[PDB]
Design a protein around this ligand. Structure first.
Ligand code: HEM
Ligand code: HEM
Ligand code: MYR
Ligand code: MYR
Ligand code: NAG
Ligand code: NAG
Ligand code: NAG
Ligand code: NAG
Ligand code: NAG
Ligand code: MG
Ligand code: MG
Lengths: 240, 240
């Protein structure tokens, strides 16, 4: 029963907190989360993701409580807190630079080129294109970042994020694991719901059972291999 | 400014959730946390630890948000949820069995014998006795549990727990890193504040700066070495 017309996109001001996640950033830019990006709890994320995207509480509780670790507060974050490297934030992002060699927070068009140019000859991104992008992004980090971290955990998180953009920005059947380029590009480049472009919130719930096989197929097609430590240890709080 | 007369010890009833932590169990048994042990948030833990023990928000926010990972709820746990192996719960506990070979949840008198018998000829437990206990408990797990997990992280958590019993149950100067056996034994065996025995809440705040040197000294005296891959990865949620 959400009224999207009561949730206009507004550009964030210079002091509105935004993070490395286009999903949460977009929700804030439409006021599903606080536009200032501050004082955000897991219940707020659960509600916002449901209302905005029809993403269910299973994934948002699991991911949300991990995200909470990035702040110094008892039960809230600022979106910018999520840039904390090695909690969720990882190398070989789709649209951000690796923290060791650049800006791990803001959208970067040069990084995004790989995704933007994927699935040549189609007007959608899909599971095979998403896998290719992941392969190529990881190769770039291995080439250029002397502090690169690549573990089973980061690889899984990366495939989860690719599954998110394929499903949440779909043309309405998220099971298909494909999304119009026009919608995904707006999502990343503007952190806006592409409403005027024709996007509508999925009428199918997006939950762990739906995402699981998509995640696994993306991983499988990405020709991923362990390269190093492979210990899936997360950073448990800031300033440790 | 805490009225302990308004916080009597009551034995947990059959539907009351209790976990592997004597600290939180004791707070629940005195109603500083809900006596039913359910729907417990990090803000509730922060307040309860302050009121009951003069433990500060630094450690309780950090540990509390990690503890939140153990439930399926957005921002609360039941105390029993904390038994989830490999989040905080670990092998070589002071008063519980290793999950692979026994009950990792309930107080176990046979396990507790090692701590109870430590520091012979004194009426206190102290840093050297706590270190000996940790050495002996870990040795027991290495002997009897083929699946033992023993890492920098579990070792730190274990010394933190020893530091907690030495400080929170002290005779009122937690800096000393020694606690009356009569107080610590009641804490573990009954999950009760030993008020009739003469214990009083510390007038000195117990925070990370106070605990840190105690933790480090316990580790130093314990003749510790890691096991296997020494991977500090935590379990990020239940049913994975
Ligand atoms: C529990 C809620 C969420 C948390 C805590 C969260 C956290 C994060 C974090 C920290 C990152 C940065 C990882 C990195 O690239 O280094 C990220 C990336 C991403 N998230 Fe979220 N996220 C959440 C929900 C969502 C939702 C609902 C979507 C919906 C589409 C989404 C889509 C993405 C995408 C596509 C990326 C990849 C960005 C890139 O690689 O450049 N997230 N998330
Ligand atoms: C408030 C002050 C606290 C005190 C004094 C305290 C004390 C202790 C002690 C002494 C143990 C060791 C029990 C043993 O080895 O048999 C322990 C274990 C544990 N504590 Fe706490 N604790 C406190 C707060 C917390 C908090 C905030 C959390 C998480 C929300 C937590 C979670 C646990 C867990 C999961 C264990 C089990 C680890 C294991 O032995 O395997 N504790 N605690
Ligand atoms: C088991 C994979 C489910 C997808 C979870 C990805 C969300 C990333 C945040 C971290 C929370 C759990 C991570 C994980 O188990 O993959
Ligand atoms: C210097 C901090 C030591 C105290 C940590 C107590 C353990 C809390 C549970 C896990 C949360 C952080 C992990 C850790 O650094 O020990
Ligand atoms: C943050 O949110 C809580 C819960 O709604 C509220 O009590 C508090 O006043 C808020 N603080 C700020 C600075 O907005
Ligand atoms: C993705 O789209 C390309 C181009 O249409 C196609 O070759 C490929 O088979 C598709 N992959 C999947 C998984 O649908
Ligand atoms: C990063 O890699 C460089 C070059 O190998 C090394 O000096 C450094 O210790 C590594 N760690 C970090 C994060 O600085
Ligand atoms: C409180 O915790 C219970 C599990 O003990 C859970 O079912 C519930 O969602 C939480 N809040 C309530 C009562 O809705
Ligand atoms: C602990 O107490 C014993 C027995 O009195 C004593 O020998 C030992 O030195 C004490 N250790 C510390 C750290 O005070
Ligand atoms: Mg990144
Ligand atoms: Mg244990």
């Amino acid at each position: 029963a959400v009224d999207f017309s009561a949730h206009p996109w507004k550009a964030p001001g210079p002091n509105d907190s935004r993070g490395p996640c286009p999903g949460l950033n977009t929700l804030a830019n439409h006021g599903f989360l606080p536009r200032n990006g501050r004082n955000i709890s897991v219940p707020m994320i659960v509600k916002a993701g449901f209302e905005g995207y029809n993403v269910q509480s299973d994934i948002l509780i699991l991911a949300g409580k991990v995200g909470m670790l990035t702040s110094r507060e008892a039960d809230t974050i600022s979106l910018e807190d999520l840039k904390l490297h090695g909690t969720i934030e990882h190398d070989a992002s789709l649209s951000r630079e690796d923290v060791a060699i650049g800006d791990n927070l803001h959208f970067n068009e040069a990084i995004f080129t790989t995704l933007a140019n994927s699935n040549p000859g189609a007007d959608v991104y899909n599971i095979s294109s998403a896998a290719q992008v992941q392969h190529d992004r990881l190769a770039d980090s291995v080439a250029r970042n002397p502090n690169v971290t690549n573990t089973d955990l980061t690889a899984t998180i990366r495939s989860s994020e690719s599954a998110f953009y394929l499903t949440v920005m779909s043309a309405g059947d998220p099971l298909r694991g494909e999304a119009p380029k026009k919608f995904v590009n707006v999502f990343f480049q503007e952190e806006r719901m592409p409403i005027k472009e024709g996007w509508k919130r999925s009428t199918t719930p997006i939950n762990l059972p739906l995402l699981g096989p998509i995640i696994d197929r993306i991983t499988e097609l990405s020709d991923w291999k362990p390269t190093g430590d492979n210990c899936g240890a997360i950073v448990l709080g800031p300033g440790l």
